[PDB]
Amino acid sequence: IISILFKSIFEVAFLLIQWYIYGFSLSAVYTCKRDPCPHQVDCFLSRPTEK
Amino acid sequence: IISILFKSIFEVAFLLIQWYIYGFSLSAVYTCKRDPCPHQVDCFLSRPTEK
Numbered sequence A, B: 001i002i003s004i005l006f007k008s009i010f011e012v013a014f015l016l017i018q019w020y021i022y023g024f025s026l027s028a029v030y031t032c033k034r035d036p037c038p039h040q041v042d043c044f045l046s047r048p049t050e051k
């Protein structure tokens, strides 16, 4: 029983973490505002739809 | 008299136009926000202090 409970707990925890960090989709264009980049810059991902 | 008046008028008009457009100094770094440039970009002048 403990093993089954822990399996479910880990599954739920990983799903929640993924939802918080990324969501469940990826966009083609990303806006970056981190040094040393000046102001904001546009970046482009690889294979967003397939992913 | 008319010629002297017009000389002075033209001088004042040109000074006012220059003050409105540029001022009386130039900075080394310029911020550009015009298409097709994305977001804002930084540009650098030539010989700002001498000018």
Ligand SMILES: CCCCCCCCCCCCCC
Binding pocket: A002, A003, A006
């Ligand atoms: C000797 C008892 C073995 C049964 C273990 C079932 C519980 C496993 C919990 C896993 C916790 C996470 C470890 C990385």
Ligand SMILES: CCCCCCCCCCCCCC
Binding pocket: A010, A013, A014
């Ligand atoms: C089963 C794995 C648990 C891992 C817990 C780690 C938490 C990750 C950090 C949470 C977000 C921090 C944002 C500052």
Ligand SMILES: CCCCCCCCCCCCCC
Binding pocket: A024, A025
């Ligand atoms: C069993 C439920 C499966 C449906 C999950 C749908 C998640 C939302 C995905 C939205 C993607 C839209 C394309 C950008």
Ligand SMILES: CCCCCCCCCCCCCC
Binding pocket: B002, B003, B006
């Ligand atoms: C025949 C009279 C000549 C005297 C002319 C003095 C006035 C000049 C006015 C200039 C106006 C701007 C012309 C471009």
Ligand SMILES: CCCCCCCCCCCCCC
Binding pocket: B010, B013, B014
């Ligand atoms: C003696 C020369 C007179 C020239 C007058 C031209 C005015 C210049 C335009 C004024 C600024 C327009 C901002 C939209």
Ligand SMILES: CCCCCCCCCCCCCC
Binding pocket: B024, B025
């Ligand atoms: C007769 C008065 C002459 C003084 C004019 C000064 C104009 C202001 C210039 C400021 C430049 C400061 C360096 C960026």
